[PDB]
């Protein structure tokens, strides 16, 4: 039946109805009205009700006024989408995607549902824009409006990535987050479609906390399940699986980490980076790439979550020192040591503080000495890290060719420190076997 | 226009080819700008999406045998060519093999899947045996040669048409070598 | 081939009405409509190594000759 | 040469050398792939 297969593909690819029963069914598919009423409704009744809904939506938010001129127009009562050309259809698709990104925040409200019902019953968005409509209803997958949209969706018009929804169309129940997350770990296409929808919204600054929390939660659980799948024990397969995970993730996180204007999606990308650095055993250069981009990316609004994710990233590294620009922007951080004590009450900041002290000591600048002194007297490092940091400081003092005055002032303050850090510093002096009084009287004379 | 650190100093980029189709990049597959590249010291091709800054999108690993100076089996990649306006990429290696791969449309494939392949021995031929005659049939005595090579494969060559010759398969060897870590980087696919 | 050609011939490239052969440090160019020799391109260098024509020659599509 | 055996063709050999192939489009439906 190759002819029946070719004709089945033609009938599935066809878009306009060609017999009266097909026109009546396609006109009967609605969100609000039952089918027995929605068959016998002209486009003046639908436009009156749904324009009352759009008047309420346009009085709520200001930015619906171009759609007042182009989508919800009295002339747009009459336009048939299947009679315009391909470029008119593509521009109408752009206008519809912009309205759906705009209306996704208020979609629990009956004005916004009336506006989406106008788009569905006039422009047939459930058939021609199934991707954007299904993606903008996906963060509301626990509501009866999503159940009704799932009821009126055509089956073969859904994209391949959203074909987990077929049992929930056969039995009209809302799909659970376990089903969405499990299909996100199995298919990279569904995770890429959700992340592409929310990043395309957040570039147009039409974000809302429901969408941001939705994407952050599903990418966090999807990266969790994806790491638990990618783990193999064989060396070359786990190398290739880490590379495939990074190639599937990298654009999304590389944009959502440095999206400065949207701190919610920035914090959600920090959450995904923290999961990726803790659970997945990655490499040191990948973790320095993540830290350098976070350091380039933070604001004042995400500074303390950025520092938490930075503590996790620096903790799960095998190398001991940080790569420059990380230490430069953490110099630019306002209250470093007090914030690190507030984090170290719950998060073990020791390797970050050790790498910070080493990367400051590797600078020959002398505007880092209050930060070095505070990080040493902080009680954040361990005894061995404090000892090797002070040894590197005295070695830098021996390597310098003023500078030595501030160096000796810092060294005499660190030697005359009070507690266990001062005990370990004087013990480090005793095991490097070099006298205090030489450089003491050399700087005092 | 773009600058890309595409090679190691020990592994220089040797063949590059661009996809003239008009789609295949941008994590959705509907944006253009894909370039494949290969080095002669490896056996893996690399696909770049040139759109934002020129990121990498996939590495097709062990498209041919990776060349080893210690091993008897030859290897490398001599050429990559995207065909004109088509998804297929024809690659030809030094290990007596010509493969053509194809990018899928409806699921997004960053690395392609193989559609045509011809191969031969990747090493000299150790033993030969003309097959006995199909009793008086169209085969005769002089159609099927049976060649056992030094690359551990037994091929059945056909002198009549050179396209109906195929390796007598020892099982799912490439599936075993992909479910092991033998295609990424332990022993080798010949072993 | 020219008489004073004592080099291997690395690649061939046909375009316009010209076929072009990059040998090793030397390019021999024939005219394709008559299949006749036309001239010979000699790149020059100051060092011994830098004269060598690795890679090859390629045409750009809308660039004349 | 020989008095009995004359060479015919090296079979079992599609691309053994460093010489790259060359592809030419025939029409709108075929490609010729030429190896050495």
């Amino acid at each position: 039946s190759s002819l029946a297969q070719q004709l089945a593909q033609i009938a599935a690819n066809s878009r306009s109805s060609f017999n009266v029963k097909a026109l009546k069914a396609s006109h009967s598919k609605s969100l609000i009205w039952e089918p027995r009423v929605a068959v016998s409704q002209t486009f003046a009744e639908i436009y009156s009700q749904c324009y009352e809904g759009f008047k309420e939506l346009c009085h709520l938010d200001s930015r619906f006024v171009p759609f007042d001129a182009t989508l919800f127009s009295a002339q747009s009562q009459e336009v048939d989408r299947t009679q315009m050309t391909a470029e008119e259809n593509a521009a109408l698709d752009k206008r519809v995607d912009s309205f759906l990104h705009l209306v996704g925040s208020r979609l629990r409200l009956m004005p916004a549902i009336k506006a989406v019902e106008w788009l569905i019953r006039r422009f047939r968005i459930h058939e021609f824009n199934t991707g954007t409509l299904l993606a903008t209803f996906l963060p509301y997958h626990t509501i009866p409006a999503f159940v009704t949209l799932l009821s009126i969706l055509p089956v073969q018009r859904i994209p391949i990535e959203y074909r987990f929804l077929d049992p929930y169309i056969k039995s009209l129940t809302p799909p659970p987050r376990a089903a969405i997350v499990q299909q996100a770990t199995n298919r990279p296409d569904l995770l890429s479609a959700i992340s592409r929808y929310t990043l395309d919204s957040c570039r147009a600054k039409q974000e809302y906390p429901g969408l941001i929390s939705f994407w952050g939660g599903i990418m966090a659980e999807a990266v969790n399940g994806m790491i638990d799948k990618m783990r193999s024990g064989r060396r070359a397969i786990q190398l290739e699986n880490d590379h495939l995970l990074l190639q599937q993730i990298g654009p999304v996180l590389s944009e959502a980490m440095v999206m400065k204007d949207v701190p919610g999606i920035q914090i959600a990308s920090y959450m995904v980076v923290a999961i990726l650095a803790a659970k997945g055993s990655l490499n040191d250069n990948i973790l320095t790439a993540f830290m350098e981009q976070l350091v380039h990316g933070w604001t004042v609004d995400t500074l303390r979550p950025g520092l938490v994710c930075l503590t996790m990233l620096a903790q799960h590294r095998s190398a001991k020192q940080l790569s420059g620009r990380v230490a430069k922007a953490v110099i630019k951080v306002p209250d470093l040591v007090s914030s690190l004590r507030d984090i170290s009450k719950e998060h073990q900041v020791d390797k970050l503080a050790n790498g910070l002290v080493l990367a400051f000591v590797d600078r020959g600048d002398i505007r880092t000495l209050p930060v070095i002194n505070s990080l040493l007297l902080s009680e954040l490092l361990q005894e061995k890290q404090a000892k090797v940091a002070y040894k590197a400081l005295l070695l830098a003092a021996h390597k310098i060719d003023n500078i030595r005055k501030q160096v000796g002032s810092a060294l005499v303050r660190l030697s005359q420190a009070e507690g266990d850090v001062g005990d370990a510093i004087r013990t480090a002096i005793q095991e490097v076997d070099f006298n205090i009084e030489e450089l003491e009287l050399k700087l005092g004379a | 226009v773009l600058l890309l650190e595409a090679g190691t100093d020990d592994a220089p980029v040797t063949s590059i080819s661009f996809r003239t189709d008009g789609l295949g990049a941008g994590q959705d597959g509907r944006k253009d700008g894909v370039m494949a590249t290969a080095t002669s010291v490896s056996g893996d091709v690399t696909f770049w999406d040139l759109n934002k800054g020129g990121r990498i999108m996939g590495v097709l690993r062990s498209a041919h045998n990776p060349p080893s100076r210690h091993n008897i089996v030859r290897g490398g990649i001599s050429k990559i060519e995207f065909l004109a306006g088509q998804p297929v990429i024809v690659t030809s290696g030094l290990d007596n093999s010509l493969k053509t791969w194809i990018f899928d449309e409806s699921p997004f494939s960053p690395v392609p899947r193989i559609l045509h392949q011809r191969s031969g021995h990747a090493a000299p031929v150790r033993c030969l045996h003309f097959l006995p005659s199909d009793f008086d049939g169209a085969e005769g005595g002089n159609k099927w040669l049976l060649s056992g090579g030094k690359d551990r494969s037994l091929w059945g060559w056909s002198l009549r048409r050179d396209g109906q010759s195929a390796e007598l398969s020892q099982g799912a060897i490439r599936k075993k070598a992909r479910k092991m870590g033998l295609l990424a980087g332990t022993t080798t696919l010949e072993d | 081939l020219p008489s004073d050609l004592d080099q291997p011939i690395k690649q061939i490239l046909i375009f316009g009405g010209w076929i072009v052969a990059c040998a090793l440090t030397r390019i021999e160019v024939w005219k394709a409509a008559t299949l006749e020799h036309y001239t010979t391109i000699f790149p020059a260098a100051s060092k011994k190594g830098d004269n060598e024509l690795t890679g090859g020659a390629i045409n750009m599509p809308t660039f004349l000759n | 040469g020989s008095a009995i055996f004359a060479p015919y063709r090296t079979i079992g050999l599609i691309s053994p050398t460093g010489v790259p192939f060359t592809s030419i489009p025939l029409g709108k439906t075929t490609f010729q792939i030429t190896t050495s």
């Binding site: - | 189709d21 306006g85 899928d104 | 375009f15 316009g16 599509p61 | 075929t30």
Partner: peptide, 22 residues
């Protein structure tokens, strides 16, 4: 099932003939 590849057919593509750069 969805996500399966179809048969291979050579897509007709118009190429720039390079015999006119002369």
């Amino acid at each position: 099932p969805v996500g399966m590849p179809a048969k291979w057919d050579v897509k007709e593509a118009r190429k720039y003939n390079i015999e006119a750069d002369g």
